[PDB]
Design a binder for this molecule. Structure first.
Ligand SMILES: *[C@@H]1O[C@H](CO)[C@@H](O)[C@H](O)[C@H]1NC(C)=O
Ligand SMILES: *[C@@H]1O[C@H](CO)[C@@H](O)[C@H](O)[C@H]1NC(C)=O
Ligand SMILES: *[C@@H]1O[C@H](CO)[C@@H](O)[C@H](O)[C@H]1NC(C)=O
Lengths: 50, 57
């Protein structure tokens, strides 16, 4: 394992789908808030129904 | 453009990801987008424009 800052790991993972790195760094708070919100929907879905 | 920015403790370099090869940071290694204020964790450094010594001839 090689350490890397998670914001830079997500910039590499964006660069892996043909979206340029700056699209993440210029939107990092939005991308974090969309991810944190989406993990919240997973919890609530799994609490709601078996 | 490809690779990552890296510092040896005092200098700044750009390298490919999977093998350490330090290159002097330049406008052909990099691309601009927008002003400094937006990027979280940005740092100040020179970026060398390789044309300027050619024009200085
Ligand atoms: C970093 O790189 C420069 C390249 O000229 C070198 O002079 C310096 O000794 C290196 N090491 C440190 C700790 O800065
Ligand atoms: C890294 O996190 C520390 C707190 O743990 C903070 O003081 C520092 O400014 C942060 N640096 C960057 C590049 O985000
Ligand atoms: C980066 O450089 C500019 C111009 O010298 C300065 O206004 C800014 O405060 C610097 N930022 C840091 C973190 O040193």
């Amino acid at each position: 394992a090689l350490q890397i800052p998670f914001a830079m790991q997500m910039a590499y993972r964006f660069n892996g789908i043909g979206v340029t790195q700056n699209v993440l760094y210029e939107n990092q708070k939005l991308i974090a808030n969309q991810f944190n919100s989406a993990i919240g929907k997973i919890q609530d879905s799994l609490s709601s129904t078996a | 453009r490809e690779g990552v920015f890296v510092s040896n403790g005092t200098h700044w370099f750009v390298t490919q990801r999977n093998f350490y090869e330090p290159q002097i940071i330049t406008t052909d290694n990099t691309f601009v987008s927008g002003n400094c204020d937006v990027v979280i964790g940005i740092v100040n450094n020179t970026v060398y424009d390789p044309l300027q010594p050619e024009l200085d001839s």
